[PDB]
Amino acid sequence: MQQYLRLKAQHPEILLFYRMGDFYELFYDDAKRASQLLDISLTPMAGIPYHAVENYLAKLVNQGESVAICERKVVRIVTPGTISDEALLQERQDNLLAAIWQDSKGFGYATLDISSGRFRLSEPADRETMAAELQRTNPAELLYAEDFAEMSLIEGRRGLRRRPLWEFEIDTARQQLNLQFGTRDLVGFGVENAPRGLCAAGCLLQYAKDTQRTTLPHIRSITMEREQDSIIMDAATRRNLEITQNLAGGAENTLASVLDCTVTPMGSRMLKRWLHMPVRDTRVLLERQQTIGALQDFTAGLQPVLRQVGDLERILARLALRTARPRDLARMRHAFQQLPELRAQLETVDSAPVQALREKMGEFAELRDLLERAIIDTPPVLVRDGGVIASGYNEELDEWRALADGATDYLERLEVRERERTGLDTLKVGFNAVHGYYIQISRGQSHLAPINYMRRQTLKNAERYIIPELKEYEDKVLTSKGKALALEKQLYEELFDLLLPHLEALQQSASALAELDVLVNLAERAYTLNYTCPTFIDKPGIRITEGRHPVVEQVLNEPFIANPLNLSPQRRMLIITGPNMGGKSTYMRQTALIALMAYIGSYVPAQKVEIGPIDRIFTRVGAADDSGRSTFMVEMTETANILHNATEYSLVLMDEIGRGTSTYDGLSLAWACAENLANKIKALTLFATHYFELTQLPEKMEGVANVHLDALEHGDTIAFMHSVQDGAASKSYGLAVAALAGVPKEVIKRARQKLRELESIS
Amino acid sequence: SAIENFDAHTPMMQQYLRLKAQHPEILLFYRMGDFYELFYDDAKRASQLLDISLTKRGASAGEPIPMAGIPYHAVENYLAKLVNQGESVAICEQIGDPATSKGPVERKVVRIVTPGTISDEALLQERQDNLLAAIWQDSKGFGYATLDISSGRFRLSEPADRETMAAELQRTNPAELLYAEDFAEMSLIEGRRGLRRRPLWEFEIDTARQQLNLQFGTRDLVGFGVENAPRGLCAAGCLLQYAKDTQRTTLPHIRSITMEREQDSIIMDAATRRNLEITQNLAGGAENTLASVLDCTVTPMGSRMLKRWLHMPVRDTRVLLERQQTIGALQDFTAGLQPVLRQVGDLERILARLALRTARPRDLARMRHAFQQLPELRAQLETVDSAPVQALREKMGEFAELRDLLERAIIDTPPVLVRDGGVIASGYNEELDEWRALADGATDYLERLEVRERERTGLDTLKVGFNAVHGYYIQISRGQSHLAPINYMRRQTLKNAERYIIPELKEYEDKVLTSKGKALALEKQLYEELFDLLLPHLEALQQSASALAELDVLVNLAERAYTLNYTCPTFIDKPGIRITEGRHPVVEQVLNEPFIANPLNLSPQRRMLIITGPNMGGKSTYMRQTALIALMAYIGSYVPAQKVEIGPIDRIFTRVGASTFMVEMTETANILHNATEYSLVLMDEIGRGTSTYDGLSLAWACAENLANKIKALTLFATHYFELTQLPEKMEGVANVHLDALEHGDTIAFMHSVQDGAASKSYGLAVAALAGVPKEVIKRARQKLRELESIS
């Protein structure tokens, strides 16, 4: 079997599936990696059943592996960043291709969603912004230049693809990009003067094209992302705020789990994009708020109708690629059938943005009518066997079908005729591939078959025969069906030619429907969850009245205690003191989440919110735990990131810095960090701490005040109160907890004596 | 909902529903000819779990019956999927003969496949024990029992409290856990796999005693050392009933039960076990564990045994000296013994299948292969001067007769199953050989008939063949078929060929199949007979496999000791630990650079060490290697050090600092309530409160209690410099630290333990190393000099 080997040499860096009967089999290393990735026997050879290959392809692709199929020649390849088949994608997750490269001036980065055609480029200012973008976009497949210096950024990621340096040449990029978009220059996309980014996108587009060997007419635009356009959040922050993913890798108990009740998969994905990239331009935000408010009373009637639109976005991709299947057209039709109802319901809404979405949504009455006449109500999965084109659409087809039915009705009458004649009740006509049509009689009656019957196949308990009057009509049936089938196929490909001219307007429509779904959803969440519209002020500041954690309040069956916050250039840092279980962390995270939601355009969980501009959010809240430096090391590294990068427009949340080292070292560090944040950086800061010594800071510097949480001892337990009050904590509860936990009474008494001794010299 | 009373059901469903009523909560594979079928909700569930098609069976009266099923010859693949998901499955077979049965043939559930009850090679993992366990509790404590169905090993214990019980669950890691319906502490078992709620009556003491005595063939349990332990007996009683219920045959390999007493082993709490990464690393994997380094056994039963020793260190001085002696004596015979031991394989699990009467042909083959290694092992070991080695050499036995039997009765390389014959070799039984002669006359005859008839008729396409559906035949092409003799009886028609039969061929066929059936039945009768001949020696055979496995462990431990440069530890009368040049057995293998060996001196005068040093300076490692060295000494193994003198240890406790604080405090409370002068306590950065000093205050109070009242051997790593003052105040406490060097803007970690407290805490240096701006560090150093001037 040197055929497999020599054929593997073609794509050596890609897993090779080799058709062997009703299975695909991998050999050698390929068998290895495959077994430990899919959990199957490493009998070296491994394999998977032909009827489940798409399942295993989805898994491999999900783990960043490209896969070449073979049936003997490489007839198909799938790469993680360029798949478009529904079976291989996850409904509610974006699947991106990206390219990264480094210049002497900085980084170049680009991403592509091969289904929607959403194409973005950027030029991250440094290793830190780059890391945040990599984490935010989370590409399924990453193209990188060989000479990539700072490999620490991408090493460890799945789907890494090393590419030759010549693939990142700008002259070639501009040309290829201009040709793809059909323009002479890129000025209209606002990227004409962004070479690094362009080099990344040029490489990406070429890879995509090579992977598809098809035109990509749905990729008609590209957009540049600027640092100042969005609130910046690093991986740790992004992780610690649990936006779309909890700290345990799951999806429950995240912000998305409470905010994302969209009715469409494209809506869901778009909402997740918004959550991860809050915008800083209040014009956009004011527009989103207005819409949220205007849509309120229309939510109930709009959602069930929007639900029927489905994932038009991804279907449209298969239309552009010419791989759409009968039920894709059926769903597109069904989606077109909702447009007039959506138009009529949106007509009354007093909102310029809603009216624009309403126009952008379109109608497509012609395409609607076409698919109504061309395809049957509930077509099969594939066109392969026909039965997709409805009767009455084409005259020829209608005829061939009438002949086949006629020849079929004859053979049915032939059966009843041959029965009464021969008088053999077991007699019937059946069809098969090997023998085509045939006549069957049971064994016990077979000896009475007419002499003109020719014997073709004996079964355990029956004989099958043929006669000329049989093979005659078999031809009438087979030749007819065959033509009908060929016709259906041609009529089906014709549907593509009639639909594709409107591709651009169809893409705008799906885009609009996706945005409506997002906005209608946020309108329903605000009204349902008692949110309020925040207002924007000129200078940095946050004023919350009765704010809540939007996730914790929906999960716990205990009353959530709402809390105020007042931060301004005059009251810039709060030293938060008190218990562990008291509510410090929650209180800090809800501040960040409220800021985030305000900068997505959504209403927020409070009675009132006034908030200034915010360039970035830092949350050093929660835990260390790495392969893993050490808790204190990590905690200090994240602190260093905040002190090097925060500005006066930053929101900073710090959670008991100092734990994990000596008392004096830890106290000295916390004091110094807090002083630098307050007097030099001047960022709006929530500084949680266990050090009572830090509560003297407000008497040493302006812009710093003490707030705290307290507890209540009652019965045989402790009730950690969750109300933030002014001033410093005056109690500690560590000994009380130790007593409840069963620490022997003698030890507690000795610890009490030691505590007072320690706290007094202070 | 149609009213589904008995009489409204067909005879099939009356029989089925009645059987299903005996296994209401588990899947029932129902034998229906060539398929095992499931119905109603079982069909829907099976459809989902096995990815098979959900169909239906029509009904004259009522709703159609949801149906699913698989070919009987493919059950083992489907059982695998089920058992790997924790599903039990009852296997119902046809008992009667349909030909002589009026209505439905008699059916019976002959076995229940469950996660902790499997014995088939295809369902188990070679190097992992698969245990069935049963648990229960009353007001004073817990009853617990375990059984390895593939070895007969039956154990009972009575964990005194919750942590002990939790530690035991973790140590034994049962694949199936039976628990009494009134269990109060569900937190102990809530998350486990194969959890099985059981009725209270299955834990009745009188019934347990009666059933255990019946199973062991005794009048009382005095001889097994468990007459005294009714709380454990209740659990074993539940367990044995479950085991008999799942196998539904005798279990002659379960001939004994042993009690595991506290005093007999070093009791390790859960945090200790998970923090020393004995067989599972902290990330749940098998990489870089104690076992990954020490387990180079060559037999699967040996690998299992070694992991059992690692988790259960023994406190019997005698056992320990004997193991050491063996390890020292055999050190030179390693290379010669291992290749031969490897060939004995997993005789333990094969013997279980023998006992269960499920052993397949290749099990007897491997058993035979194992018997053929004994003479060489006997020879290799006679020289080795060591009483314990000769005791093992004897226990191992030889079984010459049994070896010869299997050599005479089974072919060199038999097939996977007995079902289709070809297992019993020729010369073993004359009747069998005779019946086979007929079945093997096949091709001289068949070819002879073909030629003869081809020449006589002159039809060159003529051929003789066989078909399972239609039988033997003479084939002539459609073209020349019209020229066949009129004597030829038409049997089967094909598209381009015609098949016929003649009396001669029919007659040959009628005897080739009856004799084939005769041969196959005799083969199966003689295969069963092998069991009857082997079983009487089951007891001596189990002793043999047990000795073979212990030999594999000790031979392996001897090779590790030599290869990894270990030394033999000695034991002292009083609690204490004296290590010269000690290393962490795992860390020193993974780490790509020399490991810095360190000493340790613990005694009743020097019983608590306060350990300081910078982050990443080696604190946790130093503590962990102390525990591992102790652990390794108490399995009878040599140790990673230049020298080690160690006293008695009853328990090892661990507390690794980092809701929480509620758990940290609960656990430290457990330590203070249960540690003794013979305990080894490892406190890693404990004491964490809500303010500056409450946590430190508690760690201080805790340390004082450990030093002054309990007097246990304690290693107390901390970053609280305040605690370096303890030695001044308390007898028995001393300072040690991990050395670090600060040269300009860098910090080097020496990794070596020195006496006294560290010169300084390196928090600020470590923070500067983490990238914290120099301006901040400069402010912090200023703040620090204010604080340092208070005293």
Next chain:
DNA sequence: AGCTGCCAGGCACCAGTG
């Protein structure tokens, strides 16, 4: 070597004579 479809062996179900 690559598709199709008969068969395996339980029991019940049904239409056609008693």
Next chain:
DNA sequence: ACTGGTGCTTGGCAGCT
């Protein structure tokens, strides 16, 4: 009450290409 045909799972492989 008989007789003789139908159906239903999935794996194996005859029978045709």
